[PDB]
Amino acid sequence: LTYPFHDWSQELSPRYAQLRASDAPVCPVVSEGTGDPLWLVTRYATAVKLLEDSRFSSEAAQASGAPRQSPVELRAPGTRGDAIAMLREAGLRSVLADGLGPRAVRRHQGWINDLAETLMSELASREGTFDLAADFVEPLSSALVSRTLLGELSADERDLLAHCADTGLRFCGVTHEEQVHAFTQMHEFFLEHARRLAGTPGEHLLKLIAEAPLSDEALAEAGSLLVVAGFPTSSGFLCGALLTLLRHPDAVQELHAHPERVPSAVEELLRYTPLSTGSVKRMATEDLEIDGVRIKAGEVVMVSLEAVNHDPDAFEDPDVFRPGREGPMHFGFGRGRHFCPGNRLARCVIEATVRAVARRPGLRLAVAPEEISWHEGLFFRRPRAIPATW
Numbered sequence: 001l002t003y004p005f006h007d008w009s010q011e012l013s014p015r016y017a018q019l020r021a022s023d024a025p026v027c028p029v030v031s032e033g034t035g036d037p038l039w040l041v042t043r044y045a046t047a048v049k050l051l052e053d054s055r056f057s058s059e060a061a062q063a064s065g066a067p068r069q070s071p072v073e074l075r076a077p078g079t080r081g082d083a084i085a086m087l088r089e090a091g092l093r094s095v096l097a098d099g100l101g102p103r104a105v106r107r108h109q110g111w112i113n114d115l116a117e118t119l120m121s122e123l124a125s126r127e128g129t130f131d132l133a134a135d136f137v138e139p140l141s142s143a144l145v146s147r148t149l150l151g152e153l154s155a156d157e158r159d160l161l162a163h164c165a166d167t168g169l170r171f172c173g174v175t176h177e178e179q180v181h182a183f184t185q186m187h188e189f190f191l192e193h194a195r196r197l198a199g200t201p202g203e204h205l206l207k208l209i210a211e212a213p214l215s216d217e218a219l220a221e222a223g224s225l226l227v228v229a230g231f232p233t234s235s236g237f238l239c240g241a242l243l244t245l246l247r248h249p250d251a252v253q254e255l256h257a258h259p260e261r262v263p264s265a266v267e268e269l270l271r272y273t274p275l276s277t278g279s280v281k282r283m284a285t286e287d288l289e290i291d292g293v294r295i296k297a298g299e300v301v302m303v304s305l306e307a308v309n310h311d312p313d314a315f316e317d318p319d320v321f322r323p324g325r326e327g328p329m330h331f332g333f334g335r336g337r338h339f340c341p342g343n344r345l346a347r348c349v350i351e352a353t354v355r356a357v358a359r360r361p362g363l364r365l366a367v368a369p370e371e372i373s374w375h376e377g378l379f380f381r382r383p384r385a386i387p388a389t390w
């Protein structure tokens with residue numbers, strides 16, 4: 001069985017449920033991209049055990065030379081590629097909390113909600129249809145990255161970074177050397193500009209890092225991290241969440257009537273809406289055992305968050321979008337020590353988007369869901385456009 005399963009749209013591959021129901025708690029696959037053997041976990045209970053055992057190491061699975069699911073290493077050649085580790089290493093946990101935590105949300109939620117309303121209001125004033133991907137998600141996610149993470153970017157700089165992320169974070173669709181060069185271009189951009197970006201107005205995280213008590217190569221790796229972790233993820237997820245909402249007008253109607261139910265809908269979108277077409281992954285740093293299956297030192301085990309989020313043993317009717325369902329914690333931000341530190345800002349922008357939609361009932365797709373076209377091969381699913389109208 002080769003990996004990934006080429007399920008580039010919101011329709012999850014049937015392989016995930018087939019492995020979930022199989023008689024083994026971990027299943028062998030082979031990387032289509034490298035030929036590397038890998039282990040794959042699809043059950044919630046097993047995923048909790050793996051992701052909360054620190055002897056399964058994320059950094060070891062990211063290291064140059066690890067068995068891997070990507071066709072190329074996710075780093076500019078000659079660089080370390082372990083930015084968030086390096087930053088927590090140098091003693092910046094405090095600064096990451098300031099730039100990503102509840103205080104950052106308090107600083108930014110005002111303009112984020114103003115911008116979501118402004119973008120939706122301009123679309124509502126247009127005669128004709130519009131594109132929720134290009135006209136709502138792209139400006140909102142670009143503003144999030146610029147104001148809270150990198151600093152003010154020109155349009156051309158934003159486009160270059162967006163292109164680098166779409167070219168480098170891929171299972172297929174580009175040559176290996178094009179994929180590698182995307183990381184080289186991004187790194188060389190931040191070698192030239194990361195310090196410049198820190199010296200602009202704002203409280204964006206890259207400034208906070210650059211002002212804390214770092215070499216240009218380290219600051220450049222911080223910039224590349226914020227692009228790959230913050231830009232295609234937020235844009236892919238907001239696009240997918242809008243598709244989910246547009247396909248559930250009864251749910252939107254309930255949020256319109258009961259705005260206090262929006263936070264529950266945000267959490268259910270994170271469970272229900274698929275994002276990555278690959279898996280979180282960890283290297284066994286010694287011989288380990290998971291639900292009876294031996295994992296030798298150096299072997300890499302992946303967890304599909306999509307598969308876990310749709311596990312019927314965890315969630316009753318897992319394929320139903322049900323805000324306010326009462327089951328366990330979703331896996332949309334992961335689990336354990338590597339739980340997405342962007343979760344506060346992500347939840348902020350997701351909530352701003354849900355509220356903007358819930359205030360304007362009647363918003364609908366201008367084509368059929370099957371006429372939606374998907375970028376093929378991205379790590380993080382994204383439709384090419386979302387034609388919509390009132």
Ligand code: HEM
Binds near residue numbers: 225229331
């Ligand atoms: C402001 C935007 C975001 C920022 C700055 C951000 C930042 C990060 C960083 C730095 C990590 C690495 C943590 C580590 O390896 O210890 C991470 C992990 C993660 N992020 Fe985000 N993120 C953002 C948005 C998102 C979104 C929108 C999603 C999902 C919808 C998401 C899902 C995840 C997941 C699942 C992980 C865990 C990966 C793993 O366990 O290996 N992130 N994020």
Ligand SMILES: O=C1N[C@@H](Cc2c[nH]c3ccc(F)cc23)C(=O)N2CCC[C@@H]12
Binds near residue numbers: 229379
């Ligand atoms: O910091 C990291 N953590 C893990 C998981 C992760 C978080 N965000 C991501 C965005 C793209 C991607 F391919 C992987 C990740 C990982 O694999 N990393 C390589 C690139 C960023 C790095």
Ligand SMILES: O=C1N[C@@H](Cc2c[nH]c3ccc(F)cc23)C(=O)N2CCC[C@@H]12
Binds near residue numbers: 380
């Ligand atoms: O496809 C991928 N997924 C991440 C882990 C992950 C799963 N779901 C996510 C949602 C958001 C995010 F930022 C990261 C992930 C990861 O390690 N990769 C290495 C190569 C493919 C990439």
Ligand SMILES: [Ca+2]
Binds near residue numbers: 065067
């Ligand atoms: Ca190796």
